[PDB]
Design a protein around this ligand. Structure first.
Ligand SMILES: CC(=O)N[C@@H]1[C@@H](O)[C@H](O[C@@H]2O[C@H](CO)[C@H](O)[C@H](O[C@]3(C(=O)O)C[C@H](O)[C@@H](NC(C)=O)[C@H]([C@H](O)[C@H](O)CO)O3)[C@H]2O)[C@@H](CO)O[C@H]1O
Ligand code: NA
Ligand code: NA
Ligand code: NA
Length: 204
């Protein structure tokens, strides 16, 4: 056996202030995989260094016959919690999944984007706003679109909240005097909703 384990990963996008969890699938022609490391490219054959330190991983059922077949691949959990203080611009971390078969053949690390989604993957860190796609709210009819009262601003925010149960509970929804909506996430990134997607009046 001189064929290394083959890996299928994916496009692993993660977001500040949020947990993430992805699975990679690993097969070997022998049907068995004994070890899995996720690592930075540098450091040579024995390195297990992986950064950022909040990237965790685990593999169940290692070292058992038939644990890594085409019909039932071995799976490695890749998971963690992204801190609020990560720098984003998106930020990118290209990483490698190395698996070993019983003969000691290890998946090779090849530095080319054409291998992305195989043993090589890109972990993309985005701001928290990018995880959400604020939904179409129920229109709030106000007296005058150029001057919402406090009660009208609160009504618009409540309609947006009711239409968006998946946004973080501690995100803050605010509405301006012309009905423009701002959603401020825990990581302090924002989404905006133009007024005429949420408010109308009967002045015409
Ligand atoms: C084999 C070896 O030791 N050579 C290293 C050389 O590999 C290393 O280059 C790194 O190569 C990897 C792919 O193998 C990436 O291309 C690294 O580029 C990026 C990345 O995608 O990982 C770009 C990205 O924009 C960077 N992110 C941020 C937030 O800055 C990351 C990031 O700096 C690193 O991932 C942190 O570990 O790097 C590329 O750097 C170079 C430089 O380390 O050194 C050779 O000797
Ligand atoms: Na093999
Ligand atoms: Na499986
Ligand atoms: Na968004």
């Amino acid at each position: 056996d001189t064929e290394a384990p083959q890996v299928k990963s994916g496009d692993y996008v993660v977001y500040r202030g949020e947990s993430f969890e992805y699975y990679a699938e690993i097969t070997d022609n022998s049907g068995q995989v004994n070890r899995v490391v996720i690592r930075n490219v540098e450091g040579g054959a024995n390195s297990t260094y992986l950064s950022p330190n909040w990237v965790k991983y685990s593999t169940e059922n290692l070292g058992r016959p038939g644990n890594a077949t085409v019909q039932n691949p071995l799976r490695t959990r890749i998971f963690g919690e992204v801190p609020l203080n990560e720098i984003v611009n998106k930020s990118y971390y290209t990483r490698y999944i190395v698996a070993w078969d019983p003969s000691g053949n290890a998946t090779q690390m090849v530095d080319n984007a054409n291998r992305n989604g195989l043993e090589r993957f890109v972990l993309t860190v985005k701001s928290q706003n990018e995880k959400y796609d604020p939904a179409e709210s129920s229109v709030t009819y106000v007296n005058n679109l150029s001057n919402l009262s406090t009660s009208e601003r609160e009504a618009v925010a409540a309609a947006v909240r009711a239409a968006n149960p998946n946004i973080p509970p501690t995100a803050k929804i605010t509405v301006s005097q012309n009905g423009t909506v701002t959603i401020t996430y825990p990581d302090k990134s924002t989404d905006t909703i133009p007024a005429n997607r949420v408010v109308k009046d009967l002045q015409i």
